[PDB]
Design a protein around this nucleic acid. Structure first.
Length: 76
RNA sequence: UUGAUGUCACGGAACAGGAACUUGAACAACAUCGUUAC
């Protein structure tokens, strides 16, 4: 979640709705589209959270977890 | 404000069509202003 847990006045205050196309190839105009919300990254660049690990899990599963956390490229 | 044994959404170009156009000799002669007198 956001760091200080603030409050906004709706999704229009932090982002904007955008239409995404799906064009054809031969008669290259377009067809069915869809919509999403875009949020800029110069205003909300951080997200904090926790991971709770058992005590007697292992001593090498933590290594796999850390390497996978560093290797994860994209999200959202 | 999620629930866990299973998320290709970096799986998808806001794309495709519409002439700021049409009409116009930089040219020229008759007055203006109201009252006076019996």
């Amino acid at each position: 979640s956001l760091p200080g847990k603030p409050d906004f006045d709706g999704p229009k205050a932090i982002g904007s709705q955008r239409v995404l196309n799906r064009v054809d190839f031969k008669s290259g105009k377009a067809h069915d589209f869809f919509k999403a919300y875009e949020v800029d990254h110069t205003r909300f660049p951080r997200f904090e959270g926790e991971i709770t690990i058992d005590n007697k899990v292992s001593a090498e599963a933590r290594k796999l977890l850390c390497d996978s956390l560093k290797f994860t490229d994209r999200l959202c």
